[PDB]
RNA sequence: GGGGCAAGAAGACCCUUUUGAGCUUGACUCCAGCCCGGGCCUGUGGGGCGGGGCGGCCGGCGCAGCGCACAGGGGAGGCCGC
């Protein structure tokens, strides 16, 4: 509606399945604000670290397939590459292009499998909306996957949990109280700040209540 | 008193003038006057009745399902008594 229409901030974030004390695994917070999706990086504002370097958030599956390049980077793990290249039928017909899982934070697709890369293995490789960054057949990826895990864009709000200040804090230690999480997004850029309801919430180990 | 076309008097008769005046109308172009609406002057109320801001209340089967997962969902933890 308008840039400061959500004048009241996230304020209390401790209120989900709080019950006896810990709603989630602990007093960890998955309560957050979801986005409209009008912009991917401008309106929502990709953020600088939300707090001190934290965890990959949802802890997505470790099954990235992009490219081997140098084997030692992650050969045993399979994190460097999963062998879906024997299934080379994917470009002609994408029968199992994303059938395994879309859970991984990044469905990395490199130039190794670029033969099979169109839209099924190209943009939209993971039907679930997130962002991959495969480096090159010439140089190793794996080491660099900084802008997607751990520091998560406001675009991945509807489909992911978010630590916007933990349940542990009495009252509020986010917004004005902690500016690491709230800073760049004073307002949603051109978009009116208000999106859906008071907050999306999008909780994990809790009800993802929409108000 | 026959004439001096005797004198009046820059003919009002009939024209002409890109000369007028009084009058008329249903000429052209308009103006006072009046009627008619909307504002302002110009407050304090009661309403009807919609709107209208708040302002509760509830939603919700391709369901393949553990089950009207509305979608958006999501974790494997807590506190329905999972």
Coordinates of C-alpha atoms (C1' of nucleotides) in Angstrom, one line a residue:
Chain A
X1 CA 0.0 0.0 0.0
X2 CA 2.6 2.6 1.1
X3 CA 6.4 2.4 2.1
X4 CA 5.9 3.1 5.8
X5 CA 2.4 1.5 5.9
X6 CA 3.8 -1.3 8.1
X7 CA 4.8 1.3 10.7
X8 CA 4.5 -1.3 13.5
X9 CA 7.5 -3.5 12.9
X10 CA 7.8 -7.3 13.4
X11 CA 7.8 -6.4 17.1
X12 CA 7.0 -9.6 19.1
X13 CA 8.4 -12.5 17.1
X14 CA 8.3 -14.9 20.1
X15 CA 4.5 -15.6 19.5
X16 CA 4.0 -19.0 17.7
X17 CA 3.6 -22.4 19.2
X18 CA 5.5 -21.0 22.2
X19 CA 3.5 -23.2 24.7
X20 CA 5.7 -24.3 27.6
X21 CA 8.7 -22.4 26.3
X22 CA 10.4 -23.6 23.0
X23 CA 8.1 -23.6 20.0
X24 CA 10.8 -25.0 17.7
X25 CA 14.0 -27.1 18.2
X26 CA 14.8 -24.5 20.8
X27 CA 13.9 -20.8 21.2
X28 CA 15.0 -20.6 17.5
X29 CA 12.6 -18.3 15.5
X30 CA 11.1 -19.2 12.1
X31 CA 8.6 -16.4 12.4
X32 CA 9.1 -13.8 9.7
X33 CA 7.5 -11.6 7.0
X34 CA 6.7 -13.1 3.5
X35 CA 6.9 -11.2 0.2
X36 CA 4.5 -10.4 -2.7
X37 CA 7.2 -11.5 -5.3
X38 CA 6.9 -8.3 -7.5
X39 CA 10.7 -8.0 -7.4
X40 CA 13.4 -10.7 -6.8
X41 CA 16.3 -8.5 -5.5
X42 CA 15.2 -4.8 -5.6
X43 CA 11.8 -4.4 -3.8
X44 CA 12.4 -7.1 -1.2
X45 CA 16.1 -6.2 -0.9
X46 CA 18.6 -9.1 -0.8
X47 CA 20.1 -8.6 2.8
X48 CA 23.6 -8.3 4.3
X49 CA 23.9 -11.0 7.2
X50 CA 20.7 -11.0 9.2
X51 CA 22.7 -11.6 12.4
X52 CA 26.3 -12.8 13.2
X53 CA 27.2 -15.6 10.6
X54 CA 24.4 -18.1 11.3
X55 CA 23.4 -21.5 9.9
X56 CA 22.0 -22.3 6.4
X57 CA 18.5 -21.8 8.0
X58 CA 16.2 -24.6 6.7
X59 CA 19.3 -27.0 6.5
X60 CA 18.4 -28.2 2.9
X61 CA 19.5 -31.6 1.6
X62 CA 23.2 -32.0 0.6
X63 CA 22.5 -33.4 -3.0
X64 CA 23.9 -30.6 -5.4
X65 CA 24.9 -32.0 -8.8
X66 CA 26.6 -29.1 -10.9
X67 CA 30.1 -30.3 -12.0
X68 CA 33.0 -32.5 -10.8
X69 CA 35.8 -30.1 -12.0
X70 CA 38.6 -31.1 -9.5
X71 CA 37.4 -34.3 -7.7
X72 CA 38.9 -33.5 -4.2
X73 CA 36.6 -30.5 -3.5
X74 CA 33.7 -32.9 -2.5
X75 CA 34.1 -36.2 -4.4
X76 CA 33.2 -38.5 -1.4
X77 CA 30.2 -36.4 -0.4
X78 CA 28.7 -36.2 -3.9
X79 CA 28.0 -32.5 -3.0
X80 CA 30.2 -31.5 -5.9
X81 CA 28.3 -33.7 -8.4
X82 CA 25.5 -36.4 -8.4
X83 CA 25.6 -38.9 -11.3
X84 CA 22.4 -37.9 -13.3
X85 CA 24.6 -37.7 -16.4
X86 CA 24.2 -41.4 -17.1
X87 CA 20.5 -40.3 -17.5
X88 CA 21.6 -38.2 -20.6
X89 CA 18.0 -38.5 -21.9
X90 CA 17.2 -35.3 -19.9
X91 CA 17.7 -32.8 -22.7
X92 CA 15.7 -34.8 -25.3
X93 CA 13.0 -35.6 -22.6
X94 CA 13.3 -34.3 -19.0
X95 CA 11.8 -37.5 -17.4
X96 CA 13.7 -37.3 -14.1
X97 CA 15.1 -33.7 -14.4
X98 CA 13.9 -32.6 -10.9
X99 CA 12.1 -35.9 -9.8
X100 CA 14.8 -36.7 -7.0
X101 CA 14.1 -33.6 -4.9
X102 CA 13.8 -29.8 -5.1
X103 CA 14.7 -29.5 -1.4
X104 CA 18.4 -28.6 -1.8
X105 CA 18.8 -24.8 -1.4
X106 CA 20.4 -24.6 -4.8
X107 CA 19.8 -27.0 -7.8
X108 CA 23.2 -26.1 -9.2
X109 CA 23.3 -26.8 -12.9
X110 CA 26.8 -26.4 -14.5
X111 CA 28.2 -26.4 -18.1
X112 CA 29.0 -30.1 -17.6
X113 CA 25.3 -30.8 -18.1
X114 CA 24.7 -27.7 -20.3
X115 CA 23.8 -30.1 -23.1
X116 CA 20.6 -31.0 -21.0
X117 CA 20.1 -27.3 -19.8
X118 CA 17.1 -25.5 -21.3
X119 CA 14.3 -24.6 -18.8
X120 CA 13.9 -28.1 -17.3
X121 CA 17.6 -28.0 -16.2
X122 CA 17.9 -24.2 -16.8
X123 CA 16.0 -21.4 -14.9
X124 CA 13.3 -23.4 -13.0
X125 CA 15.6 -26.4 -12.5
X126 CA 14.2 -26.5 -8.9
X127 CA 10.4 -25.9 -9.2
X128 CA 10.8 -24.4 -5.7
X129 CA 11.9 -20.8 -6.1
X130 CA 15.6 -20.2 -5.1
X131 CA 18.8 -19.0 -6.8
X132 CA 21.9 -21.2 -7.9
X133 CA 25.5 -20.1 -8.8
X134 CA 27.5 -22.8 -10.6
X135 CA 31.0 -21.4 -11.5
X136 CA 32.6 -23.0 -14.6
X137 CA 33.8 -26.3 -16.3
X138 CA 37.2 -24.5 -16.2
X139 CA 37.2 -23.6 -12.4
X140 CA 35.8 -25.2 -9.2
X141 CA 32.5 -24.2 -7.7
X142 CA 31.6 -25.9 -4.3
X143 CA 33.8 -23.4 -2.3
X144 CA 31.6 -20.4 -3.4
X145 CA 27.8 -20.7 -2.8
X146 CA 27.6 -17.5 -0.6
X147 CA 24.4 -15.7 -1.9
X148 CA 21.8 -18.4 -1.2
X149 CA 22.6 -20.2 2.1
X150 CA 23.3 -18.9 5.7
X151 CA 22.2 -13.6 4.2
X152 CA 19.0 -15.1 2.5
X153 CA 17.1 -12.8 0.1
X154 CA 13.6 -11.6 1.1
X155 CA 12.4 -13.5 -2.1
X156 CA 13.0 -16.8 -0.3
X157 CA 10.5 -15.9 2.5
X158 CA 7.2 -17.7 1.5
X159 CA 9.0 -21.1 1.1
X160 CA 11.6 -21.0 3.9
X161 CA 11.8 -20.6 7.7
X162 CA 13.4 -17.3 9.1
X163 CA 15.4 -16.4 12.3
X164 CA 14.1 -12.7 12.5
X165 CA 15.2 -12.5 16.2
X166 CA 14.8 -15.6 18.4
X167 CA 11.8 -16.5 20.7
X168 CA 14.4 -16.3 23.6
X169 CA 14.4 -12.5 23.7
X170 CA 11.7 -11.1 26.1
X171 CA 9.7 -8.5 24.0
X172 CA 11.7 -7.4 20.9
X173 CA 15.4 -7.6 20.1
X174 CA 14.9 -7.1 16.2
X175 CA 13.9 -4.1 14.1
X176 CA 15.3 -0.9 15.8
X177 CA 16.6 -3.2 18.6
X178 CA 18.8 -5.3 16.3
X179 CA 19.7 -3.6 12.9
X180 CA 21.6 -6.6 11.4
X181 CA 18.3 -8.2 10.4
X182 CA 16.5 -5.0 9.7
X183 CA 18.5 -2.2 7.8
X184 CA 18.6 -2.3 4.0
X185 CA 14.8 -2.7 3.9
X186 CA 13.7 0.6 5.5
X187 CA 10.7 0.3 3.0
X188 CA 10.2 -2.3 0.2
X189 CA 12.0 0.1 -2.4
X190 CA 9.4 1.2 -5.1
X191 CA 6.8 -1.3 -3.7
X192 CA 4.5 -0.4 -0.8
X193 CA 6.0 -2.1 2.3
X194 CA 2.7 -3.9 3.2
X195 CA 2.4 -7.5 1.6
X196 CA 0.0 -10.1 3.2
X197 CA -1.6 -9.7 6.7
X198 CA 0.3 -8.6 9.8
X199 CA 3.1 -11.2 9.0
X200 CA 3.5 -14.4 6.9
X201 CA 5.0 -16.2 9.9
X202 CA 6.2 -19.2 7.7
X203 CA 7.2 -21.3 10.8
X204 CA 9.1 -24.6 10.9
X205 CA 8.5 -27.1 13.8
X206 CA 5.4 -24.9 14.3
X207 CA 2.2 -24.0 12.5
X208 CA 2.8 -21.7 9.5
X209 CA -0.2 -19.5 10.5
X210 CA -0.8 -16.8 8.0
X211 CA -1.9 -13.9 10.4
Chain B
rG1 C1' -49.2 95.6 -63.4
rG2 C1' -47.2 93.3 -69.7
rG3 C1' -42.1 92.4 -69.0
rG4 C1' -37.2 92.9 -66.5
rC5 C1' -37.0 83.8 -66.8
rA6 C1' -38.2 91.6 -60.7
rA7 C1' -36.4 90.0 -55.6
rG8 C1' -37.3 85.9 -51.6
rA9 C1' -34.6 81.3 -50.4
rA10 C1' -27.2 77.5 -51.2
rG11 C1' -35.7 73.9 -53.7
rA12 C1' -38.0 70.4 -48.4
rC13 C1' -40.2 68.0 -55.3
rC14 C1' -36.6 63.8 -58.4
rC15 C1' -32.0 61.8 -58.1
rU16 C1' -26.8 61.2 -56.4
rU17 C1' -23.7 61.1 -51.7
rU18 C1' -19.9 54.5 -49.1
rU19 C1' -24.0 62.5 -45.5
rG20 C1' -27.5 62.2 -41.3
rA21 C1' -31.6 62.2 -37.6
rG22 C1' -36.9 60.5 -35.5
rC23 C1' -39.4 55.8 -35.6
rU24 C1' -40.2 50.4 -36.3
rU25 C1' -39.3 45.1 -36.3
rG26 C1' -39.5 38.9 -36.5
rA27 C1' -32.3 43.6 -39.4
rC28 C1' -27.1 43.0 -37.6
rU29 C1' -24.5 43.3 -33.0
rC30 C1' -25.6 44.1 -28.1
rC31 C1' -26.9 46.3 -22.8
rA32 C1' -29.7 47.7 -18.4
rG33 C1' -34.1 45.1 -15.9
rC34 C1' -36.2 40.4 -14.2
rC35 C1' -36.3 35.1 -13.8
rC36 C1' -33.6 30.6 -12.9
rG37 C1' -29.7 27.3 -10.8
rG38 C1' -24.8 26.4 -8.1
rG39 C1' -21.4 28.8 -4.4
rC40 C1' -20.3 32.4 -0.2
rC41 C1' -22.7 34.8 3.7
rU42 C1' -24.3 30.8 7.5
rG43 C1' -25.0 28.5 13.2
rU44 C1' -26.8 24.3 16.3
rG45 C1' -29.1 19.8 16.1
rG46 C1' -32.5 14.9 15.1
rG47 C1' -32.8 11.4 11.5
rG48 C1' -34.1 8.0 7.2
rC49 C1' -31.1 5.6 3.9
rG50 C1' -27.1 3.7 1.3
rG51 C1' -22.3 4.5 1.4
rG52 C1' -18.1 4.9 4.1
rG53 C1' -13.3 4.4 8.0
rC54 C1' -12.8 1.4 11.8
rG55 C1' -14.8 -3.4 13.2
rG56 C1' -16.0 -8.5 15.3
rC57 C1' -17.2 -13.3 13.0
rC58 C1' -16.1 -17.5 10.1
rG59 C1' -13.4 -19.6 5.7
rG60 C1' -10.4 -23.7 3.0
rC61 C1' -11.5 -32.3 -1.2
rG62 C1' -7.0 -33.1 -8.0
rC63 C1' -6.2 -34.3 -2.4
rA64 C1' -3.2 -39.1 -4.9
rG65 C1' -4.3 -38.3 1.8
rC66 C1' -1.9 -40.7 8.1
rG67 C1' -6.8 -37.1 7.0
rC68 C1' -12.2 -31.2 2.9
rA69 C1' -3.2 -30.8 3.3
rC70 C1' -7.6 -24.7 -0.1
rA71 C1' -3.2 -22.3 -1.6
rG72 C1' 1.5 -20.8 1.5
rG73 C1' 2.8 -24.6 3.8
rG74 C1' 6.6 -26.8 6.7
rG75 C1' 9.6 -29.3 10.6
rA76 C1' 11.0 -34.3 12.8
rG77 C1' 9.8 -31.4 17.9
rG78 C1' 7.2 -31.1 21.7
rC79 C1' 3.4 -30.4 25.2
rC80 C1' -3.9 -32.7 21.6
rG81 C1' -3.2 -36.8 25.1
rC82 C1' 2.4 -36.6 18.4

